[PDB]
Design a binder for this molecule. Structure first.
Ligand SMILES: [Zn+2]
Length: 368
């Protein structure tokens, strides 16, 4: 027990604050006390981050932890392990559990398991409808009391478009976002949500986008000031061409893995938490985005979507810090796979860029 951590000698990047440079970080009592050149204080753990990139803990707003219900595919513990090894200090879990996250009991189980694992923050989402069934609007006042940070029906989508409408109405008084899509229909669903979003004032977040029209559609509503955001999974990216384009223009707000543990295979998609970064770094290596923007899409933008004050290194914030070497080579296989599943096309490829430390509330929760 010392209360004090110094991360010396790394390149700090904090897009939230426009901060970039060779700084040291003083961490004190869970929280960030100082950023400055050349720091030394008695009574502190030093971490030599020379050569490495130091930035806010990544946040991922789209993960399937499969818990309860399908914990052979994955569960809160192995999911949290994946997460911290991939530089994530907060993951948002989706409600297509069994039983589904539609009552406080399940919320409360998920928070409890979470505190016991100890590794990263898990924030619950609630379903939009009771039992995700499609008919009745769920109890938002109480699920948000209990700790839910978004509502979604993940893998049934509200076709009944006046349900979706009530969802956005209530979402907007409670100040939480509605998430949609997963599994010309895509474009029509996105335009419906945008239209419905502007009328209601509610924030809609689009979870899958696959075509140039959809991006243009979202981009249209965004310039009209509609509160509509979207994500792309960076393991996807290797018109798939226009997705790369929309990351460029800044139309896609954040990366989110849509970590999707499967045991049989033969939409369904793929595990992702441990490979997101080397993935996203490929775009940086081919010059599609800078390092600032790539960190932006893992930190502050996702933070802003689910409205939590994370993803910064503001003096005060919780010391949620990721430290990575963008140049280190490693291979996802049995040796290094921390997921209970195995389902990603990246298995056995050489990936480039590995997280070296993950710090949450000032405690080390992962070390290489
Ligand atoms: Zn999903």
């Amino acid at each position: 027990w010392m209360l004090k951590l110094i991360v010396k000698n790394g390149y700090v990047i904090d897009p939230s604050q426009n901060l970039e440079g060779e700084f040291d970080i003083l961490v004190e009592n869970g929280k960030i006390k100082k950023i400055d050149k050349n720091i030394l204080v008695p009574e502190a753990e030093i971490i030599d981050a020379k050569g490495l990139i130091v930035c806010p803990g990544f946040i991922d707003i789209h993960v399937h932890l499969r818990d309860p219900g399908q914990t052979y595919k994955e569960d809160i513990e192995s999911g949290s392990r994946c997460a911290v090894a991939g530089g994530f200090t907060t993951i948002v879990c989706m409600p297509n559990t069994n039983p589904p996250i539609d009552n406080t009991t399940v919320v409360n189980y998920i928070l409890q398991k979470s505190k016991s694992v100890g590794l990263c923050r898990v924030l619950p989402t609630g379903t939009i409808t009771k039992g995700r069934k499609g008919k009745e609007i769920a109890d938002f006042y109480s699920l948000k009391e209990a700790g839910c940070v978004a509502f979604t029906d993940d893998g049934s989508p509200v076709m009944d478009s006046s349900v979706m409408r009530k969802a956005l109405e209530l979402a907007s008084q409670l100040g939480v976002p509605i998430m949609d899509h997963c599994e010309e229909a895509e474009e029509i669903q996105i335009a419906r949500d945008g239209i419905l979003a502007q009328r209601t004032g509610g924030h809609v977040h689009i979870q899958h986008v696959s075509t140039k029209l959809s991006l243009e559609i979202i981009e249209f509503f965004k310039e009209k000031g509609v509160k509509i955001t979207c994500e792309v999974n960076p393991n996807h990216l290797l018109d798939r061409l226009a997705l790369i384009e929309g990351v460029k223009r800044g139309i896609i707000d954040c990366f989110a893995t849509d970590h999707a543990p499967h045991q049989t295979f033969e939409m369904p998609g793929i595990i992702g938490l441990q490979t997101a970064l080397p993935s996203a770094l490929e775009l940086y290596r081919k010059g599609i985005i800078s390092l600032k923007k790539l960190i932006e899409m893992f930190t502050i933008n996702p933070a802003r979507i689910i409205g939590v004050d994370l993803g910064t290194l503001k003096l005060g914030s919780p010391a949620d810090i990721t430290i990575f070497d963008p140049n280190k080579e490693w291979i996802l296989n049995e040796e290094t796979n921390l997921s209970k599943s195995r389902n990603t096309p990246l298995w056995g490829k050489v990936l480039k860029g590995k997280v070296i430390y993950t710090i949450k509330d000032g405690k080390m929760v992962y070390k290489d």
